[PDB]
Amino acid sequence: LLGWGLKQAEEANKTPDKPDKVWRIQAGKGFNEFPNKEYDLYKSLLSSKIDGGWDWGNAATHYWIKGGQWNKLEVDMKDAVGTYKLSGLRNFTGGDLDVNMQKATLRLGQFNGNSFTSYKDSADRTTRVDFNAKNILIDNFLEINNRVGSGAGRKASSTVLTLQASEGITSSKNAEISLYDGATLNLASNSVKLNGNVWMGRLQYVGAYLAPSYSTINTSKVTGEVNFNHLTVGDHNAAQAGIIASNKTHIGTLDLWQSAGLNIIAPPEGGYKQKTEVQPTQVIDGPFAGGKDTVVNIDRINTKADGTIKVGGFKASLTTNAAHLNIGKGGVNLSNQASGRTLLVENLTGNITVDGPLRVNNQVGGYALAGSSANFEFKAGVDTKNGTATFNNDISLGRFVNLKVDAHTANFKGIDTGNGGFNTLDFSGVTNKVNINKLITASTNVAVKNFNINELIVKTNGVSVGEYTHFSEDIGSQSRINTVRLE
Amino acid sequence: LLGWGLKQAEEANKTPDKPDKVWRIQAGKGFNEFPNKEYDLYKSLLSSKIDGGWDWGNAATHYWIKGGQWNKLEVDMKDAVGTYKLSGLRNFTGGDLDVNMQKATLRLGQFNGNSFTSYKDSADRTTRVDFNAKNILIDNFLEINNRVGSGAGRKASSTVLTLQASEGITSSKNAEISLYDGATLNLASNSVKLNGNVWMGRLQYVGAYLAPSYSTINTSKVTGEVNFNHLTVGDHNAAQAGIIASNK
């Protein structure tokens, strides 16, 4: 019920833990003299101070450091050369690694995945697993803060995974990163390029459809080229993911759930940076404004939608503070079940530039039933009130679909509502101008205070009555239409 | 049986409390760059270190700070700009806020009221809720030291609310301030003008017609123009209110 902005700002500034028995391992001879050897990291080095096991109560396996889950382990290589791999460390509960590998390639997957989880003690600890490799090369799935077995036993608190390459963090095609309710993920390389299905927000327990399920991917340190490929937020719940980006974020296909949010956050303008017991200062940030050169290049926004029938829709949404928000040639899809699903492509302090056709149920026409009001909704520059919402591609609306745009200046290239009807084509939030190029209406509820639609076809609507183009608010004194053409 | 003059002079000079776990929150980026944004203060900022709940025994809701009602919370903005609102923090038992908002307009009501209460522990603590806004703009009802639910459960000790604007503390027409048996209210702005029904002394419990029911409004610091509109003392009992005025 907190929302993502409180929970991230609470999880950001924490002391790590108070660990007793801080184990230390230093890799000595043999490692720093074979540059191609393809070692194994668990079996040859890490298994000295990590013991396996079984958890009585929902186990498959189990791992911790030494003498319980409250013991920090350092590994201090700093000159080991080779390629190392984990390849099967599943359900690591543990706590506080930091594998320190300069000039050493890692590989977080080979024939088997990985996992990094915590346990809900009375202290509610995090795990803070770190790596400091040269390349990372995920190459098989990695799950952060998963379910250990099946539901029962001890529950799972939050965790943090930090990956700190210095040449790149790539991924294979079938390497599904999937991070859950408490999980974060820090990346600090240059040129992150995750070619696999990143999955923020996922069903941590088998029935918990009402969990909050926050998650975070903090690519703020990436001095290179952030490049996701297939982001997928939410799974049968109201997930609120978030990405703290680095002012250039090209992602590929984005698949929101029905009621799943997203908070892509660009950096600021100049870049980042008995007895009374006084807690340390918790600095907390509201929604600020991104810099001048912040771009978020999504190229397709689908929506996965099946399930219940609620009294409204579910309002899939994404929220950005970047100075631009381009949406590529894939356009916008919106799957629509019985009630009216809703999309909110909101931008706080920037622009919006859509370059694709607005689909619904994955076609351009996309009919809907009576109560199913498929509602697109765009917000360009809410908090600065000088953001345009340009659509450089010809949109087309079918039946029971309701575009609305609340921007400063909503440019267009053509709106064709002549096929379906019952279209509430709202523009009431637009401050001054709506520069539509070619409008085709059958039975529409246009609400514009000032416009110049410089071509207007008005179709008829068959044989039914009581349906008509209806401008529903004050046209003002600056309006204009350079061509009306009834048919 | 003491009378008001003893009880005010006893409640005036007290050390605040001895709180362990003095939480501190500092508002960082984002707040100090939108002069018209109309934020929310509980949900966007305060709810990190205030948890809701239910009191087993006469609840509707319940609020405290963190780990019980003996934990001080500072909020240190000092440069946040906008208009903030509480709008529904009911039956706050808690203890020891001080929301410090220079150059930030507050609003203590929007579609729902507020409340600030204590609980009669064995220590008999006050709550000392403070604000340091620029305007305050009450605009819906605010009850100080109320009854939490209905009678039973834990009882309510005294409390102090301090409002410290620097441009004025106005009020809407339907904003009934009503402070009860232990409640005080310090105002330190210039030009307090409460256009609503201020109600000193009110039935704290449903049958207690023989309670003493003292109350205090201390507008001593007001360098401007104190202006009430409709003061109403006492409700079915022998209330002894008091106002420490500022010579106009």
XYZ file of C-alpha atoms in Angstrom:
735
model
C 0.000 0.000 0.000
C 3.095 2.187 0.247
C 3.748 2.449 -3.468
C 7.065 1.931 -5.159
C 8.597 5.330 -4.450
C 8.483 4.879 -0.690
C 9.715 1.299 -0.760
C 12.691 1.991 -3.009
C 13.702 5.071 -1.007
C 13.470 2.962 2.142
C 15.509 0.097 0.656
C 18.115 2.402 -0.881
C 19.807 3.790 2.243
C 20.349 0.859 4.589
C 23.372 -0.348 6.464
C 24.155 -3.866 5.117
C 23.910 -5.989 8.308
C 25.763 -6.789 11.512
C 27.472 -10.084 10.618
C 29.514 -12.067 13.062
C 32.016 -14.561 11.585
C 33.067 -12.620 8.511
C 34.830 -15.406 6.596
C 37.612 -14.455 4.189
C 39.053 -16.442 1.280
C 41.987 -15.369 -0.889
C 42.724 -17.185 -4.139
C 46.436 -17.929 -4.204
C 48.641 -19.778 -6.662
C 47.406 -21.448 -9.798
C 44.567 -19.134 -10.691
C 46.581 -16.169 -11.972
C 48.515 -18.001 -14.686
C 46.073 -19.709 -17.097
C 44.113 -17.177 -19.180
C 41.790 -19.701 -20.853
C 41.237 -22.461 -18.357
C 37.410 -22.401 -17.818
C 37.361 -23.081 -14.088
C 34.363 -23.773 -11.909
C 33.732 -21.272 -9.156
C 31.537 -23.120 -6.669
C 33.256 -26.502 -6.682
C 36.872 -25.419 -6.951
C 36.741 -22.326 -4.754
C 33.453 -21.403 -3.102
C 32.444 -24.774 -1.670
C 34.973 -24.471 1.159
C 32.728 -22.008 3.011
C 29.251 -22.756 1.602
C 27.415 -25.899 2.696
C 24.426 -27.472 1.006
C 21.497 -29.109 2.670
C 17.783 -29.757 2.991
C 15.177 -27.539 4.642
C 12.704 -29.634 6.624
C 9.616 -28.034 5.206
C 9.369 -27.430 1.406
C 12.887 -28.110 0.157
C 14.528 -29.116 -3.028
C 17.992 -27.968 -1.945
C 19.248 -25.260 0.431
C 22.439 -23.239 0.826
C 23.956 -20.893 3.373
C 27.413 -19.712 4.249
C 28.664 -21.323 7.461
C 26.825 -21.690 10.736
C 23.559 -20.140 9.609
C 22.380 -17.346 7.355
C 24.107 -14.497 9.200
C 27.746 -14.857 8.120
C 29.498 -12.666 5.564
C 31.899 -14.227 3.057
C 34.486 -12.280 1.093
C 36.407 -13.747 -1.802
C 39.444 -11.653 -2.651
C 40.994 -12.712 -5.941
C 41.933 -9.377 -7.640
C 44.360 -11.067 -10.042
C 42.786 -14.420 -10.941
C 42.516 -14.898 -14.704
C 40.194 -17.285 -16.511
C 36.476 -17.828 -16.955
C 34.503 -18.899 -13.905
C 31.009 -20.268 -13.648
C 28.406 -20.911 -10.970
C 26.076 -23.280 -12.842
C 23.634 -24.560 -10.284
C 23.707 -22.625 -7.010
C 19.973 -22.875 -6.424
C 18.043 -21.466 -3.446
C 21.017 -19.731 -1.867
C 19.621 -18.175 1.300
C 22.989 -17.373 2.857
C 23.881 -13.741 3.085
C 26.596 -11.283 2.153
C 28.879 -12.574 -0.525
C 31.120 -10.329 -2.507
C 33.126 -12.189 -5.113
C 35.828 -9.731 -6.129
C 37.199 -10.639 -9.574
C 39.100 -8.042 -11.480
C 40.412 -9.342 -14.854
C 38.293 -12.514 -14.524
C 35.339 -13.364 -16.752
C 32.304 -14.772 -14.946
C 29.426 -16.899 -16.249
C 26.250 -17.073 -14.166
C 24.799 -20.064 -15.975
C 25.893 -23.306 -17.594
C 23.277 -26.104 -18.003
C 21.564 -24.960 -14.781
C 20.314 -21.718 -13.296
C 20.941 -19.786 -10.104
C 18.901 -18.276 -7.289
C 19.457 -15.774 -4.492
C 16.894 -15.592 -1.694
C 16.621 -14.541 1.948
C 14.659 -15.833 4.921
C 12.254 -13.822 7.047
C 13.960 -13.974 10.426
C 13.049 -11.681 13.296
C 15.753 -9.317 12.001
C 14.406 -9.153 8.390
C 17.788 -9.239 6.712
C 18.838 -8.701 3.105
C 21.470 -10.760 1.312
C 23.536 -8.170 -0.642
C 25.167 -10.640 -3.043
C 27.861 -8.841 -5.030
C 30.124 -9.587 -7.984
C 32.912 -7.512 -9.465
C 33.842 -9.380 -12.635
C 35.167 -8.223 -16.019
C 32.521 -9.753 -18.258
C 29.500 -11.464 -16.710
C 27.656 -13.393 -19.477
C 24.441 -14.531 -17.740
C 23.729 -17.325 -20.264
C 21.071 -19.176 -18.222
C 18.273 -18.086 -15.917
C 18.788 -16.282 -12.628
C 15.984 -15.692 -10.150
C 16.285 -13.163 -7.353
C 14.277 -13.619 -4.122
C 12.391 -16.690 -5.288
C 10.206 -19.189 -3.484
C 12.436 -21.890 -2.028
C 10.154 -24.889 -2.297
C 6.374 -24.652 -2.143
C 4.871 -22.007 0.101
C 5.295 -23.382 3.618
C 8.257 -23.205 5.972
C 10.050 -19.900 6.301
C 9.090 -16.934 4.149
C 11.393 -14.775 2.042
C 12.367 -11.165 2.776
C 14.101 -8.722 0.438
C 17.491 -9.042 -1.252
C 19.981 -7.128 -3.402
C 22.122 -8.432 -6.259
C 24.944 -6.263 -7.576
C 26.738 -6.981 -10.843
C 29.751 -4.790 -11.490
C 31.504 -5.764 -14.710
C 33.888 -3.443 -16.501
C 33.388 -4.614 -20.092
C 29.734 -5.590 -20.423
C 26.890 -7.629 -18.993
C 25.346 -9.591 -21.828
C 22.868 -12.454 -21.770
C 21.857 -15.405 -23.895
C 18.507 -15.731 -25.630
C 17.022 -18.230 -23.159
C 18.410 -16.594 -19.998
C 15.292 -15.417 -18.175
C 16.182 -13.002 -15.408
C 13.148 -12.822 -13.140
C 13.152 -10.835 -9.917
C 10.394 -10.892 -7.339
C 8.679 -9.005 -4.464
C 11.742 -7.935 -2.527
C 14.365 -8.192 -5.190
C 16.534 -5.445 -6.603
C 19.350 -5.608 -9.134
C 22.224 -3.156 -9.469
C 24.217 -3.013 -12.697
C 27.403 -0.983 -12.900
C 29.185 -1.975 -16.110
C 29.213 -0.242 -19.420
C 26.930 -1.557 -22.203
C 24.412 -3.767 -20.467
C 22.615 -5.725 -23.188
C 20.185 -8.304 -21.817
C 18.932 -10.317 -24.783
C 16.635 -12.429 -22.610
C 13.260 -12.098 -20.947
C 13.773 -9.790 -17.995
C 10.732 -10.308 -15.781
C 10.129 -7.739 -13.042
C 7.388 -8.835 -10.699
C 6.279 -12.456 -10.589
C 4.078 -14.675 -8.416
C 6.294 -15.354 -5.435
C 3.795 -17.748 -3.864
C 1.394 -19.957 -5.740
C -1.866 -18.239 -4.832
C -0.892 -14.774 -3.603
C -2.645 -12.721 -6.254
C -2.871 -9.749 -3.869
C 0.781 -9.288 -2.988
C 2.296 -5.831 -3.554
C 5.346 -7.261 -5.415
C 7.708 -4.348 -5.889
C 10.986 -4.725 -7.794
C 13.856 -2.540 -8.942
C 16.572 -2.565 -11.595
C 19.096 0.184 -10.941
C 21.174 0.729 -14.062
C 22.317 4.170 -12.944
C 26.059 3.555 -13.180
C 26.046 2.252 -16.759
C 28.349 4.576 -18.685
C 27.638 2.799 -21.967
C 24.512 1.612 -23.751
C 21.628 0.125 -21.766
C 19.706 -2.243 -24.007
C 16.988 -4.540 -22.810
C 15.231 -6.810 -25.222
C 12.022 -8.128 -23.721
C 10.799 -6.647 -20.468
C 7.730 -8.161 -18.848
C 6.189 -6.525 -15.789
C 3.638 -8.199 -13.590
C 2.168 -11.677 -13.457
C -1.480 -12.063 -12.341
C -1.130 -9.275 -9.765
C -0.705 -5.522 -9.374
C 3.063 -5.296 -9.595
C 4.815 -1.932 -9.373
C 8.232 -2.309 -10.957
C 10.762 0.449 -11.427
C 13.941 1.194 -13.348
C 16.431 3.857 -12.321
C 17.899 4.447 -15.749
C 20.984 6.255 -17.099
C 19.538 8.803 -19.602
C 19.560 6.432 -22.600
C 17.381 3.333 -22.355
C 16.474 1.410 -25.484
C 14.206 -1.448 -24.515
C 12.474 -3.805 -26.878
C 9.031 -5.312 -26.443
C 7.400 -4.309 -23.152
C 4.590 -6.518 -21.838
C 2.626 -4.987 -19.003
C -0.018 -6.928 -17.131
C -3.596 -5.634 -16.632
C -2.839 -3.726 -13.437
C 0.956 -3.521 -13.496
C 2.865 -0.252 -13.361
C 6.350 0.853 -14.343
C 8.492 3.788 -13.215
C 11.387 4.487 -15.560
C 13.381 7.245 -13.870
C 15.924 9.284 -15.775
C 18.776 10.926 -13.831
C 18.622 14.648 -12.959
C 20.146 17.519 -14.913
C 23.710 17.441 -13.628
C 23.706 13.718 -12.954
C 23.569 12.050 -9.571
C 25.603 13.499 -6.673
C 17.402 3.110 28.340
C 18.698 5.821 26.018
C 17.565 7.874 23.035
C 18.971 6.289 19.893
C 19.112 8.616 16.907
C 18.385 6.833 13.649
C 20.381 7.907 10.575
C 18.887 10.319 8.075
C 16.612 8.736 5.475
C 16.832 10.925 2.374
C 13.726 10.457 0.234
C 12.963 11.815 -3.225
C 9.753 12.926 -4.852
C 9.098 12.834 -8.581
C 11.772 15.090 -10.044
C 12.544 16.160 -13.611
C 15.052 14.415 -15.834
C 17.870 16.168 -17.622
C 17.954 17.663 -21.086
C 19.348 14.622 -22.910
C 17.286 11.792 -21.429
C 15.681 9.400 -23.918
C 13.588 6.280 -23.288
C 13.156 4.317 -26.518
C 10.497 1.692 -26.062
C 9.630 0.045 -29.374
C 6.466 -1.974 -28.609
C 4.002 -1.950 -25.704
C 1.778 -4.981 -25.534
C -0.550 -5.910 -22.679
C -1.342 -9.386 -21.404
C -4.945 -9.528 -20.248
C -7.174 -12.333 -19.050
C -9.031 -13.131 -15.871
C -11.675 -11.509 -13.730
C -14.372 -8.888 -14.274
C -14.076 -5.945 -11.897
C -16.339 -2.872 -11.649
C -13.787 -0.916 -13.701
C -10.790 -1.865 -15.764
C -7.329 -2.373 -14.345
C -5.252 0.544 -15.769
C -1.916 -0.725 -16.948
C 0.450 2.215 -16.794
C 4.008 3.381 -17.202
C 5.504 6.561 -15.814
C 8.622 8.358 -16.968
C 10.409 11.557 -16.033
C 12.599 11.633 -19.124
C 12.775 14.603 -21.456
C 11.598 12.397 -24.339
C 9.601 9.187 -24.611
C 9.759 7.722 -28.096
C 7.650 4.690 -28.956
C 8.846 2.813 -31.995
C 7.292 1.287 -35.069
C 5.677 -1.608 -33.216
C 3.059 0.756 -31.866
C 0.762 -0.026 -28.941
C -1.254 -3.194 -28.386
C -3.978 -3.575 -25.761
C -5.637 -6.897 -25.006
C -9.239 -6.376 -23.909
C -11.341 -8.755 -21.807
C -15.005 -8.169 -20.796
C -14.481 -4.997 -18.788
C -12.718 -2.036 -20.337
C -8.947 -2.358 -20.059
C -6.996 0.871 -19.790
C -3.483 2.019 -20.686
C -1.764 5.099 -19.226
C 1.412 6.068 -21.080
C 2.166 8.863 -18.664
C 5.109 11.236 -18.808
C 5.683 13.583 -15.894
C 8.146 16.200 -17.151
C 8.688 15.432 -20.814
C 7.272 14.741 -24.270
C 5.676 11.727 -25.946
C 6.351 10.694 -29.544
C 4.376 7.673 -30.727
C 5.376 6.362 -34.157
C 3.106 3.347 -34.463
C -0.516 2.347 -34.965
C -2.641 1.973 -31.847
C -3.859 -1.619 -31.929
C -6.324 -3.355 -29.635
C -6.537 -7.160 -29.353
C -3.626 -7.019 -31.845
C -5.224 -5.495 -34.904
C -5.580 -1.925 -36.093
C -9.375 -1.830 -36.182
C -10.057 -3.741 -32.996
C -13.735 -3.857 -32.095
C -14.935 -4.076 -28.506
C -18.213 -4.837 -26.773
C -20.504 -2.380 -24.988
C -19.115 -2.239 -21.458
C -15.567 -2.920 -22.677
C -14.384 0.657 -23.114
C -10.798 0.163 -24.274
C -9.280 3.415 -23.041
C -5.968 4.742 -24.265
C -4.645 7.645 -22.237
C -1.571 9.812 -22.689
C -0.056 12.470 -20.429
C 2.765 14.625 -21.772
C 4.282 17.050 -19.314
C 1.964 16.863 -16.327
C 4.095 18.679 -13.777
C 5.814 21.207 -16.042
C 2.813 21.742 -18.374
C 4.845 22.363 -21.530
C 5.080 18.885 -23.042
C 3.827 18.035 -26.515
C 2.320 14.665 -27.402
C 3.172 14.180 -31.063
C 1.757 11.189 -32.941
C 3.772 10.837 -36.144
C 1.730 7.873 -37.378
C -1.863 7.637 -38.563
C -3.987 6.193 -35.784
C -7.352 4.516 -36.291
C -10.030 3.730 -33.727
C -12.701 1.061 -33.942
C -15.739 0.638 -31.703
C -16.016 1.500 -27.976
C -12.464 2.861 -27.850
C -11.735 6.170 -26.154
C -8.474 7.987 -26.746
C -7.693 10.838 -24.398
C -4.655 13.113 -24.356
C -3.844 15.573 -21.585
C -0.799 17.458 -22.824
C 0.346 20.945 -23.765
C 0.101 20.579 -27.566
C -1.277 17.369 -29.070
C -0.100 17.132 -32.666
C -1.519 14.382 -34.864
C -1.443 12.960 -38.371
C -4.946 11.561 -38.711
C -7.724 10.021 -36.630
C -10.214 7.663 -38.245
C -13.122 6.812 -35.948
C -15.481 6.284 -38.873
C -15.608 2.515 -38.593
C -16.932 1.804 -35.108
C -18.474 4.761 -33.321
C -19.214 5.480 -29.641
C -15.794 7.098 -29.390
C -15.171 9.569 -26.581
C -12.211 11.242 -28.254
C -11.379 13.432 -25.266
C -8.825 16.248 -25.397
C -9.999 18.354 -22.465
C -6.647 18.363 -20.703
C -4.876 19.935 -23.679
C -3.731 23.444 -22.799
C -3.847 25.242 -26.141
C -3.419 23.475 -29.481
C -4.671 20.249 -31.067
C -3.252 20.122 -34.595
C -5.176 17.226 -36.130
C -4.433 16.672 -39.820
C -7.390 14.600 -41.046
C -10.379 13.596 -38.918
C -13.010 11.047 -39.946
C -15.967 10.647 -37.595
C -19.175 8.645 -37.425
C -20.476 9.091 -33.857
C -17.831 10.786 -31.749
C -17.681 12.893 -28.575
C -14.810 15.237 -29.435
C -13.963 17.644 -26.605
C -11.468 20.273 -27.789
C -11.157 23.863 -26.599
C -8.916 25.073 -29.462
C -7.854 23.322 -32.660
C -7.164 23.554 -36.355
C -8.344 20.308 -37.930
C -7.240 21.169 -41.450
C -9.349 18.451 -43.103
C -12.618 17.034 -41.759
C -14.559 14.188 -43.332
C -17.865 13.525 -41.597
C -19.334 10.139 -42.389
C -22.815 8.931 -41.558
C -23.532 5.920 -39.370
C -25.920 3.661 -41.246
C -29.582 3.643 -40.253
C -29.488 4.068 -36.459
C -30.622 7.266 -34.767
C -29.387 9.297 -31.820
C -25.755 9.075 -32.963
C -23.899 12.150 -34.165
C -20.601 13.989 -34.039
C -20.839 16.097 -30.903
C -18.327 18.741 -29.883
C -18.963 18.769 -26.171
C -17.214 21.888 -24.871
C -16.389 25.475 -25.750
C -14.786 25.910 -29.162
C -13.351 29.281 -28.199
C -12.219 32.063 -30.491
C -9.007 30.717 -32.035
C -10.393 27.565 -33.651
C -10.266 26.782 -37.362
C -11.119 24.040 -39.855
C -9.473 24.349 -43.239
C -11.796 21.807 -44.901
C -15.128 20.309 -43.929
C -16.393 17.618 -46.281
C -19.617 15.877 -45.412
C -20.443 12.763 -47.389
C -10.976 19.811 41.182
C -7.702 21.639 40.578
C -9.127 24.394 38.418
C -7.722 25.561 35.131
C -4.941 27.774 36.460
C -3.151 24.918 38.190
C -3.559 22.492 35.311
C -2.275 24.876 32.653
C 0.697 25.925 34.792
C 1.462 22.245 35.335
C 1.155 21.392 31.627
C 3.134 24.437 30.495
C 6.616 23.582 31.798
C 7.231 19.934 30.964
C 10.097 18.176 29.289
C 8.677 16.593 26.082
C 9.449 12.874 26.646
C 12.298 10.380 26.631
C 11.906 8.774 23.189
C 14.056 5.943 21.988
C 14.240 5.415 18.200
C 14.075 9.025 17.074
C 13.355 8.482 13.368
C 14.502 11.136 10.903
C 13.291 11.802 7.357
C 14.725 14.407 4.986
C 12.858 15.338 1.816
C 15.362 15.302 -1.024
C 15.024 15.864 -4.752
C 11.779 16.579 -6.515
C 9.989 18.515 -3.822
C 11.899 21.799 -4.065
C 11.223 22.511 -7.740
C 7.443 22.562 -8.381
C 5.753 25.564 -6.733
C 2.167 24.538 -7.544
C 2.097 20.777 -7.502
C -0.486 19.979 -4.738
C 1.252 16.983 -3.197
C -0.086 14.643 -0.560
C 1.841 14.560 2.681
C 0.856 11.269 4.295
C 0.918 9.011 1.247
C 3.904 10.441 -0.589
C 6.123 11.225 2.390
C 4.867 10.385 5.869
C 3.653 6.830 5.313
C 7.212 5.480 5.306
C 7.415 5.767 9.101
C 3.746 5.723 10.184
C 1.805 2.458 10.116
C -1.948 2.055 10.269
C -3.859 -0.625 12.057
C -6.732 -1.782 14.231
C -7.001 -1.584 18.016
C -8.560 -4.755 19.409
C -11.084 -3.024 21.584
C -13.112 -0.072 20.154
C -11.374 0.705 16.871
C -12.228 2.299 13.619
C -8.599 2.853 12.607
C -5.374 3.412 14.566
C -2.008 5.031 13.880
C 1.377 5.242 15.552
C 4.900 5.958 14.459
C 7.002 2.787 14.369
C 7.254 0.100 17.006
C 4.734 1.579 19.414
C 3.637 4.987 20.625
C 6.983 6.061 22.093
C 9.021 6.976 19.003
C 9.758 10.510 17.834
C 9.647 11.342 14.121
C 11.249 14.406 12.578
C 10.598 15.506 9.031
C 13.198 17.991 7.851
C 12.201 19.605 4.573
C 13.204 23.305 5.020
C 13.122 23.974 1.268
C 10.221 21.917 -0.103
C 7.803 24.045 -2.121
C 4.194 23.209 -2.922
C 0.942 22.641 -1.076
C 0.713 19.569 1.129
C -2.291 17.955 2.715
C -3.043 15.368 5.380
C -6.686 14.588 4.561
C -7.611 11.633 6.696
C -5.075 10.874 9.427
C -7.675 9.830 11.977
C -7.007 8.633 15.541
C -3.268 9.224 15.433
C -2.038 8.076 18.834
C 1.647 8.047 17.928
C 3.769 10.671 19.557
C 6.215 13.438 18.749
C 6.019 14.566 15.181
C 7.458 17.818 14.022
C 6.885 18.447 10.340
C 9.274 21.269 9.501
C 8.112 23.076 6.345
C 9.463 26.492 5.644
C 8.152 27.958 2.339
C 5.572 25.143 2.046
C 1.818 25.636 2.318
C -0.013 23.017 4.377
C -3.674 21.964 4.338
C -5.010 20.048 7.335
C -8.180 18.879 5.629
C -9.411 17.720 2.243
C -12.631 15.610 2.107
C -11.764 14.083 5.503
C -10.723 15.311 8.922
C -7.813 14.675 11.253
C -7.280 13.648 14.862
C -4.431 13.684 17.366
C -4.786 11.628 20.540
C -2.634 9.932 23.173
C -2.977 6.752 25.205
C -2.911 6.504 28.985
C 0.158 4.350 29.525
C 1.862 4.002 32.887
C 4.065 6.940 31.849
C 1.147 9.303 30.967
C 2.765 10.785 27.895
C 1.798 13.722 25.692
C 2.069 13.740 21.909
C 3.516 17.203 21.074
C 2.548 17.202 17.388
C 4.164 20.185 15.680
C 4.002 21.896 12.296
C 6.065 24.758 10.944
C 4.369 25.621 7.661
C 3.957 28.897 5.750
C 0.183 28.938 5.429
C -1.887 26.268 7.173
C -5.487 26.469 5.839
C -7.393 24.071 8.133
C -10.319 23.617 5.701
C -11.898 20.562 7.384
C -12.368 19.470 10.979
C -9.537 18.662 13.358
C -10.098 17.087 16.758
C -7.433 17.112 19.441
C -7.365 14.368 22.113
C -10.543 12.656 20.968
C -12.129 9.344 21.853
C -10.635 6.670 19.616
C -13.601 4.362 19.221
C -16.292 3.959 21.860
C -15.250 4.210 25.485
C -13.522 0.907 26.216
C -9.938 -0.163 25.617
C -7.199 2.267 26.531
C -8.012 5.760 27.752
C -6.625 9.040 26.441
C -4.176 11.319 28.260
C -3.240 14.891 27.359
C -1.707 16.212 24.141
C -0.294 19.365 22.547
C -0.698 20.585 18.969
C 1.515 23.411 17.733
C 0.838 25.292 14.506
C 3.566 27.710 13.501
C 2.790 29.366 10.179
C 4.470 32.566 9.067
C 1.716 34.040 6.888
C -1.585 33.086 8.501
C -3.705 30.279 9.884
C -7.127 30.539 8.305
C -10.013 28.088 8.281
C -13.006 27.215 6.154
C -16.601 27.715 7.230
C -17.296 24.045 8.008
C -13.934 23.308 9.668
C -14.877 22.562 13.271
C -11.822 22.596 15.495
C -12.822 20.833 18.700
C -10.346 20.139 21.479
C -11.058 18.028 24.529
C -10.108 17.278 28.176
C -6.348 17.152 27.813
C -5.901 19.073 24.626
C -4.026 22.305 24.091
C -3.327 24.228 20.903
C -0.440 26.612 20.295
C -0.630 29.124 17.455
C 2.410 31.148 16.472
C 1.657 32.790 13.125
C 0.513 36.275 12.415
C -3.203 36.882 11.707
C -4.973 33.786 12.938
C -8.522 33.940 11.581
C -10.559 30.826 12.358
C -13.849 31.173 10.496
C -15.178 27.883 11.865
C -16.711 26.593 15.066
C -13.878 26.379 17.566
C -15.169 24.138 20.346
C -13.202 24.117 23.601
C -14.404 21.404 25.925
C -16.504 18.535 24.615
C -17.801 15.180 25.860
C -14.753 12.968 25.568
C -16.665 9.849 26.598
C -20.304 9.179 25.915
C -21.652 9.424 29.454
C -18.986 11.267 31.443
C -21.004 14.324 32.394
C -18.799 14.882 35.459
C -15.389 15.091 33.831
C -13.289 18.196 34.554
C -12.511 18.774 30.830
C -9.919 21.523 30.744
C -8.609 22.931 27.455
C -6.264 25.660 26.283
C -5.655 27.756 23.176
C -2.389 29.653 23.467
C -2.310 32.398 20.857
C 0.414 34.320 22.669
C 2.895 34.497 19.796
C 0.467 35.930 17.234
C 2.012 39.209 16.108
C -0.953 40.010 13.872
C -4.720 39.936 14.287
C -6.368 37.158 16.295
C -9.900 36.677 15.027
C -12.146 33.849 16.062
C -15.611 33.574 14.658
C -17.707 31.202 16.724
C -16.328 29.963 20.016
C -18.322 27.384 21.940
C -17.232 26.347 25.425
C -18.580 23.328 27.222
C -20.888 20.505 26.236
C -23.185 19.018 28.923
C -20.506 19.387 31.610
C -18.605 21.932 33.690
C -15.791 22.718 31.291
C -13.119 25.259 32.212
C -11.529 26.469 28.996
C -8.864 29.125 28.716
C -7.230 31.352 26.127
C -3.817 32.934 26.581
C -4.351 35.841 24.231
C -2.090 38.456 22.603
C -3.614 41.815 23.717
C -6.088 42.081 20.815
